[PDB]
Design an enzyme around this catalytic site. Structure first.
Site, short mmCIF file in Angstrom:
data_model
loop_
_atom_site.label_atom_id
_atom_site.label_comp_id
_atom_site.label_asym_id
_atom_site.label_seq_id
_atom_site.Cartn_x
_atom_site.Cartn_y
_atom_site.Cartn_z
N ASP A 82 9.21 65.34 101.45
CA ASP A 82 9.49 66.47 100.57
C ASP A 82 8.22 67.04 99.96
O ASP A 82 7.58 66.42 99.11
CB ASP A 82 10.46 66.02 99.46
CG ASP A 82 10.70 67.09 98.39
OD1 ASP A 82 10.93 68.27 98.74
OD2 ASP A 82 10.67 66.73 97.20
N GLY B 246 43.99 86.20 53.58
CA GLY B 246 44.48 86.69 54.86
C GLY B 246 44.77 88.18 54.95
O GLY B 246 44.14 89.02 54.30
N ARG C 178 47.23 89.73 53.84
CA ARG C 178 47.79 90.27 52.61
C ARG C 178 46.61 90.89 51.84
O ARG C 178 46.68 92.03 51.38
CB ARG C 178 48.43 89.17 51.76
CG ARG C 178 49.10 89.69 50.49
CD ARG C 178 49.69 88.58 49.63
NE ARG C 178 48.70 87.58 49.23
CZ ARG C 178 48.61 86.36 49.77
NH1 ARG C 178 49.44 85.99 50.74
NH2 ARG C 178 47.70 85.50 49.32
N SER D 30 36.73 86.08 52.43
CA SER D 30 37.87 85.81 53.30
C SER D 30 38.54 87.13 53.74
O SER D 30 37.91 87.97 54.37
CB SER D 30 38.88 84.91 52.57
OG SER D 30 39.68 84.18 53.49
CA LIG Z 1 10.04 70.24 98.61
CA LIG Z 2 11.42 68.20 95.56
#
Ligand SMILES: [Ca+2]
Ligand SMILES: [Ca+2]
Length: 633
Positions: free
Chosen positions: A28, A186, A188, A216
């Site tokens: 890799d 609320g 009201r 509120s």
């Molecule tokens: Ca790679």
């Molecule tokens: Ca890698």
């Protein structure tokens, strides 16, 4: 204290000979990226982008950190190989910032495995002034708002009081500072306050006001009114017709699997950015969709557009900052919100609205997010409904007296919706269904030079202490002398004395050494239920010139026989619509928990407070006149 903090900058230029060995590389090719970390500063973990199969990568990326000098600030560097499964750490490197001096702009070289070379640039400037404003005084934008609204008041106050009773103003140095107050409660409180604002608007009273404060429920109306595109050209007249149509359909029915899914999706953006999300965010959205669906992205800041030339009273909103320890809420700190700023006026700490929510360190913002939508604040301002949302789906006031600080912070066919919502939330991992429903935000006090030790803080509905936003206008620096309050607090019955909340505010005031006219403990006994009461200061002058309060209360009295102040109801139909109770009825649409207001219910509560306000203008005109004559000393 001052601060004495440093801005330690870091540039990750490039690296050469990135290897895992001849074999490792064959398997890799390195896909490098660097990661920086400083354990002595809030969320310092940062990483450059990666480069696919590059052994000689050139990043050239800059990372800034805010550091406390009294700390052993060590920059941990890590060379990584991005993978499909688990990124592999190639090498760890340490770097003490202490070994550097302010202004010094060096360039340290690092070697990993005695092969790969990486070049980093170090800097150590001096962090400038904080983003936090540390002062008790009003902010320049508020002071300018006052100075620019002053003459508008004087003119308006004259047109209202007439040339006869407006004498003292033609020579008046400073006109009186009038504040309108809406209580929580609320829908009201919301529908009620809308009738009140229609009355205060058409009667010219608003034009005499310097402030409009709410908590509120009243807050939801203010948000809707002030954010409307045509306001103030158009007024409560047209905007309330919309409010009516918007509240006629049951809001809870909005909560649909599909819509809830959109809410969670939208909120994930905020979460993804590193901000905490809670049920209040969801509640906020629901309130938003019912009230301002055509302007869901309105922010607190965008309200500056209705006050740039002081063409409206300054909108003020509030919530509470509940410390984790504090057992009694009457001791929690109040947080004020205005289009210009947000903060705790007790400790002279403020910030621009767009920073509320951002991450801070030593008074300096470290990570700035997009400004929270107004519906989020709406949610926070009325978070009592998010804590007891199960219920919204036995009065709320009753459920409230039980709730413990612990219960709100750290800790029927419509019930399916609650399950469905909770299911969608856990399924998406938006937030732990067991955590606080109250509302959370990054602690802007974090690590302050001299509660500054806790990453996040709790903000909740002020209604958890008392229903009248007095702390907002009793602030010394605002010098309010005339407070025209409107109370929509729930009472056990239509005959029940309406001073529970008021006395609580009176107690708060004394507790904080803030001027408050004495509320006589027998006002109701001697007076009986009235549409509003007046509370003049007091003969003495300890620290005199304390405000005068006109306390309107929600009660259906004269409105039963009159269609307008001096106009009686004549037809049988007229007498009918007014024949109703608020709290006395068992099947009343006006309970705090209810959100569906059919047109008749809306008109009743709306017209009621409209009438009550108008049926008492004279009482206000009087209190102003008396306020003017007091401003002659
Ligand atoms: Ca790679
Ligand atoms: Ca890698």
């Amino acid at each position: 204290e001052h601060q004495y903090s440093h801005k330690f900058t870091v540039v990750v230029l490039r690296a050469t000979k990135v290897t895992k060995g001849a074999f490792g590389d064959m398997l890799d090719t390195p896909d490098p990226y660097v990661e920086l970390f400083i354990s002595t500063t809030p969320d310092s973990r940062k990483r450059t982008r990666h480069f696919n199969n590059d052994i000689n990568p050139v990043w050239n990326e800059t990372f800034e950190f805010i550091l406390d000098p009294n700390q052993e600030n060590v920059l941990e560097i890590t060379l990584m190989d991005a993978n499909y499964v688990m990124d592999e750490t190639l090498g760890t490197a340490t770097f003490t910032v202490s070994s550097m001096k302010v202004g010094e702009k060096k360039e340290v070289p690092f070697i990993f495995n005695q092969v790969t070379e990486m070049v980093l640039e170090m800097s150590l400037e001096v962090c400038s002034c904080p983003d936090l404003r540390f002062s008790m005084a009003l902010c320049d934008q508020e002071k300018t708002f006052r100075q620019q609204r002053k003459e508008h008041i004087r003119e308006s106050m004259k047109k209202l009081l007439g040339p006869k009773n407006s004498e003292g103003l033609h020579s008046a140095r400073d006109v009186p500072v009038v504040a309108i107050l809406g209580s929580g409660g609320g829908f009201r409180a919301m529908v009620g306050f809308s009738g009140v604002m229609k009355a205060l608007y058409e009667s010219g009273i608003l034009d005499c006001a310097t402030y409009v404060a709410g908590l509120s429920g009243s807050t939801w109306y203010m948000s809707t009114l002030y954010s409307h595109p045509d306001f103030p050209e158009k007024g409560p007249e047209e905007i309330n017709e919309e409010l009516m149509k918007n509240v006629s359909h049951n809001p809870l029915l909005l909560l649909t699997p599909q819509k809830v899914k959109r809410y969670v999706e939208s909120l994930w953006k905020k979460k993804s950015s590193g901000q905490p999300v809670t049920f209040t965010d969801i509640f906020g959205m629901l309130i938003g969709e019912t009230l301002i669906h055509n302007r869901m992205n309105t922010t607190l800041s965008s309200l500056k557009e209705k006050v740039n030339t002081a063409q409206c009273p300054l909108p003020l909103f509030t919530c509470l900052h509940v410390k984790p320890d504090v057992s009694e809420l009457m001791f929690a700190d109040w947080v004020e919100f205005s289009p210009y700023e947000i903060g705790m006026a007790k400790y002279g700490t403020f910030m621009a609205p767009d920073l509320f929510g951002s991450k801070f360190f030593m008074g300096t913002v470290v990570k700035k997010y997009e400004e929270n939508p107004l519906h989020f604040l709406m949610g926070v301002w009325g978070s009592a409904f998010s804590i007891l949302f199960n219920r919204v789906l036995s009065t709320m006031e009753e459920e409230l007296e039980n709730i413990t600080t612990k219960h709100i912070v750290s800790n029927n066919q419509a019930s399916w919706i609650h399950r469905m919502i909770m299911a969608l939330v856990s399924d998406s991992a938006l937030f732990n269904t067991r955590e606080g429903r109250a509302g959370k935000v990054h602690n802007f006090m974090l690590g302050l030079n001299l509660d500054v030790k806790s990453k996040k803080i709790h903000v909740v509905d002020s209604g958890l202490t008392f229903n009248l936003p007095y702390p907002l206008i009793l602030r010394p620096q605002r010098g309010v002398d005339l407070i025209i309050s409107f109370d929509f607090s729930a009472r056990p019955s239509d005959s029940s004395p309406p001073f529970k909340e008021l006395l609580l505010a009176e107690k708060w005031a004394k507790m904080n050494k803030l001027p408050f006219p004495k509320i006589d403990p027998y006002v109701f006994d001697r007076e009986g239920l009235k549409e509003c009461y007046v509370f003049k200061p007091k003969n003495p002058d300890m620290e005199k010139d304390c405000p005068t309060i006109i306390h309107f209360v929600l009660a259906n009295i004269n409105f039963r026989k009159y269609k307008a102040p001096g106009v009686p109801r004549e037809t049988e139909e007229e007498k009918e619509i007014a024949d109703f109770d608020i709290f006395d009825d068992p099947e009343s649409p006006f309970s705090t928990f209810n959100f569906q207001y059919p047109n008749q219910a809306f008109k009743r509560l709306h017209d009621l407070m409209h009438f009550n306000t108008l049926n008492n203008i004279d009482v206000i005109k009087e209190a102003m006149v008396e306020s003017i004559e007091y401003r002659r000393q």
